[PDB]
Design a binder for this molecule. Structure first.
Ligand SMILES: [Zn+2]
Ligand SMILES: [Zn+2]
Ligand SMILES: [Zn+2]
Ligand SMILES: [Zn+2]
Lengths: 70, 72
DNA sequence: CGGCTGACTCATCAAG
DNA sequence: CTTGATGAGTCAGCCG
């Protein structure tokens, strides 16, 4: 019952994937607007409830890898 | 906290107006369905929790007079 | 209906 | 102060 992107409690199947609400609207914002997020680490940041704001780049990558799409 | 159309307990701002769930669904089917509504009295019916089922014409008219709009 | 999911809005924070 | 990112809340269509 866990968000496949950040492991928060999932609220439902959004854009094809079991995710929480915050990840649902994160993906929609990221897929429409500008694209160029930059990772400050090595593109494998830990994305969980407490750290998901740190790296949009890695959070967006995980959304794609889990299969989110419009 | 009461539906502006039938005075039943309101549920939220629906189609631009504070209304109940039943009136919300009624209004959308009225706007979009093929509907020959005719009042059996004087186009001035009492519309409440029970009587709203009797006169869809007056119920509709009240929906529109209250401001409901599917675009709102 | 009411469950499901998407669109939209707004308060709160971080940054500058 | 302003700007931008975040996430919670409300209400929309659709479906059964
Ligand atoms: Zn998540
Ligand atoms: Zn990263
Ligand atoms: Zn009502
Ligand atoms: Zn009537």
């Amino acid at each position: 019952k866990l968000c496949l992107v950040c492991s928060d409690e999932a609220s439902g199947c959004h854009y094809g994937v079991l995710t929480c609400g915050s990840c649902k609207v994160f993906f929609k914002r990221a897929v429409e607007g500008q694209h160029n997020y930059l990772c400050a680490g090595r593109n494998d940041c830990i994305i969980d409830k407490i750290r998901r704001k740190n790296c949009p780049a890695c959070r967006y990558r995980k959304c794609l890898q889990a299969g989110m799409n419009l």
